[PDB]
Design an enzyme around this catalytic site. Structure first.
Site, PDB file in Angstrom:
ATOM      1  N   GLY A 125     -21.883  -1.483 -16.154  1.00 58.65           N
ATOM      2  CA  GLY A 125     -21.319  -1.995 -17.551  1.00 58.65           C
ATOM      3  C   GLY A 125     -21.987  -1.215 -18.653  1.00 58.65           C
ATOM      4  O   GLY A 125     -22.059   0.002 -18.688  1.00 58.65           O
ATOM      5  N   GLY A 126     -22.732  -2.061 -19.457  1.00 59.08           N
ATOM      6  CA  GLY A 126     -23.375  -1.417 -20.562  1.00 59.08           C
ATOM      7  C   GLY A 126     -24.364  -0.567 -20.431  1.00 59.08           C
ATOM      8  O   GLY A 126     -24.963   0.354 -20.797  1.00 59.08           O
ATOM      9  N   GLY A 326     -11.870  37.215 -23.333  1.00 54.10           N
ATOM     10  CA  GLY A 326     -11.914  36.032 -23.952  1.00 54.10           C
ATOM     11  C   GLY A 326     -13.355  35.405 -23.665  1.00 54.10           C
ATOM     12  O   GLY A 326     -14.140  34.955 -24.490  1.00 54.10           O
ATOM     13  N   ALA A 327     -13.723  35.752 -22.407  1.00 50.40           N
ATOM     14  CA  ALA A 327     -14.810  34.790 -21.933  1.00 50.40           C
ATOM     15  C   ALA A 327     -16.031  35.475 -22.479  1.00 50.40           C
ATOM     16  O   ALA A 327     -17.000  35.194 -22.868  1.00 50.40           O
ATOM     17  CB  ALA A 327     -14.999  34.952 -20.420  1.00 50.40           C
TER      18      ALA A 327
HETATM   19  C1  ORJ Z   1     -21.359  -6.457 -16.453  1.00 47.50           C
HETATM   20  N1  ORJ Z   1     -20.539  -6.110 -17.402  1.00 47.50           N
HETATM   21  C2  ORJ Z   1     -20.624  -5.516 -18.899  1.00 47.50           C
HETATM   22  O1  ORJ Z   1     -21.777  -5.112 -18.927  1.00 47.50           O
HETATM   23  C3  ORJ Z   1     -19.567  -5.372 -19.922  1.00 47.50           C
HETATM   24  C4  ORJ Z   1     -19.743  -4.169 -20.594  1.00 47.50           C
HETATM   25  C5  ORJ Z   1     -20.516  -3.902 -21.845  1.00 47.50           C
HETATM   26  C6  ORJ Z   1     -20.528  -2.881 -22.620  1.00 47.50           C
HETATM   27  C7  ORJ Z   1     -19.815  -1.710 -21.912  1.00 47.50           C
HETATM   28  O2  ORJ Z   1     -20.213  -0.452 -22.857  1.00 47.50           O
HETATM   29  C8  ORJ Z   1     -18.807   0.311 -23.053  1.00 47.50           C
HETATM   30  N2  ORJ Z   1     -17.689  -0.033 -22.462  1.00 47.50           N
HETATM   31  C9  ORJ Z   1     -16.414   0.987 -22.868  1.00 47.50           C
HETATM   32  C10 ORJ Z   1     -15.356   1.164 -22.434  1.00 47.50           C
HETATM   33  C11 ORJ Z   1     -14.430   2.042 -22.733  1.00 47.50           C
HETATM   34  C12 ORJ Z   1     -14.790   3.147 -23.685  1.00 47.50           C
HETATM   35  F1  ORJ Z   1     -14.116   4.024 -24.199  1.00 47.50           F
HETATM   36  C13 ORJ Z   1     -16.246   2.798 -24.301  1.00 47.50           C
HETATM   37  C14 ORJ Z   1     -17.069   2.026 -23.570  1.00 47.50           C
HETATM   38  S1  ORJ Z   1     -18.962   1.582 -23.841  1.00 47.50           S
HETATM   39  C15 ORJ Z   1     -19.185  -1.859 -20.933  1.00 47.50           C
HETATM   40  C16 ORJ Z   1     -19.152  -3.085 -19.918  1.00 47.50           C
HETATM   41  O3  ORJ Z   1     -18.286  -3.088 -18.828  1.00 47.50           O
HETATM   42  C1  ORJ Z   2      -3.933  38.920 -24.146  1.00 47.69           C
HETATM   43  N1  ORJ Z   2      -5.418  38.938 -23.866  1.00 47.69           N
HETATM   44  C2  ORJ Z   2      -6.364  38.290 -25.056  1.00 47.69           C
HETATM   45  O1  ORJ Z   2      -5.593  37.814 -25.927  1.00 47.69           O
HETATM   46  C3  ORJ Z   2      -7.672  38.310 -24.989  1.00 47.69           C
HETATM   47  C4  ORJ Z   2      -8.484  37.055 -25.413  1.00 47.69           C
HETATM   48  C5  ORJ Z   2      -9.154  37.072 -26.642  1.00 47.69           C
HETATM   49  C6  ORJ Z   2      -9.827  35.897 -27.036  1.00 47.69           C
HETATM   50  C7  ORJ Z   2      -9.821  34.788 -26.167  1.00 47.69           C
HETATM   51  O2  ORJ Z   2     -10.368  33.533 -26.763  1.00 47.69           O
HETATM   52  C8  ORJ Z   2     -10.895  32.905 -25.836  1.00 47.69           C
HETATM   53  N2  ORJ Z   2     -11.266  32.739 -24.390  1.00 47.69           N
HETATM   54  C9  ORJ Z   2     -11.837  31.840 -24.040  1.00 47.69           C
HETATM   55  C10 ORJ Z   2     -12.244  31.735 -22.423  1.00 47.69           C
HETATM   56  C11 ORJ Z   2     -13.201  30.824 -22.016  1.00 47.69           C
HETATM   57  C12 ORJ Z   2     -13.811  29.919 -23.038  1.00 47.69           C
HETATM   58  F1  ORJ Z   2     -14.638  28.890 -22.472  1.00 47.69           F
HETATM   59  C13 ORJ Z   2     -13.620  29.993 -24.363  1.00 47.69           C
HETATM   60  C14 ORJ Z   2     -12.958  31.184 -24.955  1.00 47.69           C
HETATM   61  S1  ORJ Z   2     -12.113  31.664 -26.207  1.00 47.69           S
HETATM   62  C15 ORJ Z   2      -8.772  34.506 -24.980  1.00 47.69           C
HETATM   63  C16 ORJ Z   2      -8.266  35.759 -24.517  1.00 47.69           C
HETATM   64  O3  ORJ Z   2      -7.443  35.847 -23.340  1.00 47.69           O
END
Ligand code: ORJ
Ligand code: ORJ
Lengths: 426, 424
Positions: A125-126, A326-327
């Site tokens: 939960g929390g 790109g990597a």
């Molecule tokens: C034993 N039961 C509990 O403790 C109840 C409970 C309380 C808080 C809690 O925290 C959060 N939940 C979400 C769910 C979606 C989301 F997008 C964000 C949060 S943060 C989660 C919980 O089950």
């Molecule tokens: C046709 N070929 C291209 O245009 C070459 C090319 C250049 C930039 C590019 O940008 C990025 N790539 C990643 C891959 C992983 C990741 F974690 C972040 C980025 S940002 C991606 C690209 O294919």
């Protein structure tokens, strides 16, 4: 229930004889205390697994919030030890609200003081979300986070968990300074750790440990999540540094959805606390999900570009074997204002492998070739293509690599660049 | 004249006669210009699909960077029109480098000037990542990548129309107008189904709250459908809306709905856009694969987004708000500007039946099997009478005010107006 007694757990974690309670004990379900970790003034709070499963209520949550307020005011790191089934249902909405206030305090602290969670038991939960808001989460095997990426470090046992927790506040709060003499004394031929053939995979982790100080643990984060990417904290000539490195042993070392996110999160964390980065690059491309879903790597890849781009701590890049397309851009390139880019002499910096490149640029010439002559023509085209492109010399001309270095001086060359950079500006 | 012509595309986008080029037209693959969109000074660049499929090269990337620098200087919105296969392979590492410089300019612009991407043709490699770094992406049909596109247009011309509107939403935000709020008040509650256990599409609720004239620009309608987010106008002022959608997954939060909400929150916060949070959420869901990892991580990010948010953000509970999801959907504990509830709304840890089954499980277990399923009902009945209601929540202080659903618009507008532009 002795072993889960909060005073004891807090005592095993703090330096012997330093525990000083922040409030009187009670049956709230938390105990909060001030103390020291190898001399560093540290706040900590422990959920009380001997009271109602450690379930969280208004009074206990209040102790945590006060603890956070105290650590914030004194700029001390704050450690939470977690063992709890969630909010106390019988308190109803009042407990939900209080749990929220715990969240809200962790958010106020974010990037201001280090927050370390040590999960030593069931956390639901929390009590699952609390740790998720902190910077580093240590998990003992007698635990499970329920209500993959969430857990950074898995310990051997509860005592080991405290020991790793203690080291972590050392890495954040005693960052030290670079020492050239120590950097040089630790120099070795890191290149020798690579395979003989450029085509062979290898675990990057020994390269990392060879760069880092021999007598200090490398605290790897999330080792079993996104294994094409290795990240973690270590010491470089005594100075806390963060390391990111593609691991060619998994997925060819390619970037993908989870590896991008893993790297992005880790960059923003080091940036927040003044921790310089070593980025070890050996990346041949990037990948979609198994189902050809590209949305993940796009979204997460953009997050990674954004993380390096906005980063202001020193961050140096080392190209070991290859860095493609790109990597290449994403892995702390010159275009994202890397502090310095280094390369080993046989490294490749290119759009892609020469044969792949040539096979696109001359698809028509290759397909027009006689079948038994085609591969020879492909090889010849590739040889000319790499005569002019892909090498470190060419990369130095362009200016995307700053310096070609002797692999035997890797450790001291990286150190020199990080030490002499400004603490902030990229 | 070819449809892909960059000057044509720029001219269709900008106000007629407003186009002013930022550089001499060339073979670089990019044309960049200044212009106006309903009066506001805007910068735009268009990739040239007629030259090498719009592939990005050193000189084209330089035009884009210059346009970014120009926009950053004048604090103008900047719109990219994209049609491109990516980096020019033959320019090698230099083109990679220049593409990275485009990324870096976009990052420098981030949260400083609005960035809109209009993708009107095939977009790949660096040309897919460019848009991914902007704030809002509009795609024409003529151009799996789930979650990346914010808005799907009807065609290229409609895409420019939606883009133009986005400039207005970000750069002509306006002021709240209390008189227009009231003039638009209706009984929104009458849109709810009779039974509280029945699912409904939340979009007509959102629509009734927003100005009857103005369109609701929904972001990512097909991704994470249990969550609805988008921009619109409330009494003439640009607002962000987030709303659980009971029609999908019972309106539950899950890994991708938390992500969708968090990213949107961060966007509105960046540009001073106040939030209206329409809450009707019964809980949260795990992944695939009953793995909680995704929901724990994304949920945490959602907590972080609301927590750190400093724009006005008001919550309206229509029917349900339960448990941990209650906390995350802009609760008082995360410093929501104000929390409103309709009269029949439940603010609770879970349903009364479920709550009792846990609170009294030992006592329910110890009861004769024949008279247990009737004792359960009795205890739930007592529980329902003392907990869960708005009156209870009011006393606790997690709801600020119970309101007449016929006055939703003006109440929201009053709470948003009274808040500071930045605090919370
Ligand atoms: C034993 N039961 C509990 O403790 C109840 C409970 C309380 C808080 C809690 O925290 C959060 N939940 C979400 C769910 C979606 C989301 F997008 C964000 C949060 S943060 C989660 C919980 O089950
Ligand atoms: C046709 N070929 C291209 O245009 C070459 C090319 C250049 C930039 C590019 O940008 C990025 N790539 C990643 C891959 C992983 C990741 F974690 C972040 C980025 S940002 C991606 C690209 O294919």
């Amino acid at each position: 229930l002795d072993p889960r007694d909060p005073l004891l757990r807090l005592s095993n974690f703090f330096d012997d004889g330093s525990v000083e309670l922040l409030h009187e004990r009670d049956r709230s379900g938390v105990l909060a205390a001030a103390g020291t970790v190898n001399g560093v003034r540290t706040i900590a709070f422990c959920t009380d697994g001997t009271v109602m499963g450690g379930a969280m209520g208004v009074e206990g949550c209040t102790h945590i919030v006060n603890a956070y307020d105290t650590a914030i005011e004194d700029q001390s790191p704050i450690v939470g030890i977690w063992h709890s089934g969630g909010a106390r249902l019988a308190e109803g909405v009042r407990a939900l609200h209080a749990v929220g206030q715990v969240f809200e305090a962790m958010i106020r602290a974010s990037g201001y003081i280090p927050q370390i969670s040590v999960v030593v038991g069931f956390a639901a939960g929390g009590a699952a979300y609390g740790p998720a808001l902190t910077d580093v989460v240590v998990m003992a095997p007698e635990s499970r986070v329920f209500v993959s990426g969430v857990c950074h470090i898995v310990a051997d046992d509860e005592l080991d968990a405290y020991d790793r927790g203690r080291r972590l506040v050392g890495l954040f709060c005693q960052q030290g300074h670079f020492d050239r003499s120590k950097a040089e004394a630790g120099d070795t031929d890191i290149h020798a750790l690579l395979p003989e053939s450029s085509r062979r995979a290898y675990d990057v982790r020994p390269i990392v440990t060879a760069i880092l100080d021999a007598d200090t643990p490398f605290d790897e984060f999330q080792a079993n999540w996104a294994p094409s990417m290795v990240v973690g904290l270590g010491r470089l000539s005594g100075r806390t540094v963060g390391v990111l490195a593609n691991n060619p042993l998994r997925l060819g070392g390619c970037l993908n959805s989870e590896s991008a996110e893993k790297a992005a999160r880790f960059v923003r964390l080091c940036d927040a606390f003044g921790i310089p980065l070593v980025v070890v690059v050996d990346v041949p491309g990037y990948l979609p999900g198994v189902d050809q879903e590209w949305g993940g790597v796009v979204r997460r890849g953009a997050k990674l570009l954004h993380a390096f781009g906005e980063c202001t701590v020193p961050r140096v890049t080392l190209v070991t074997r290859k860095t493609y397309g790109g990597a290449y851009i994403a892995m702390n390139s010159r275009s994202l204002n890397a502090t310095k880019v280094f390369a080993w002499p046989d490294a490749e910096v290119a759009v892609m492998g020469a044969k792949a490149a040539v096979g696109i640029l001359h698809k028509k010439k290759l397909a027009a070739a006689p079948e038994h002559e085609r591969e020879a023509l492909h090889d010849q085209l590739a040889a000319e293509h790499e005569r002019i492109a892909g090498g470190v010399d060419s990369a130095l001309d362009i200016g995307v690599v700053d310096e070609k270095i002797d692999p035997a001086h890797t450790r001291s060359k990286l150190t020199e660049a990080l030490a002499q950079a400004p603490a902030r500006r990229g």
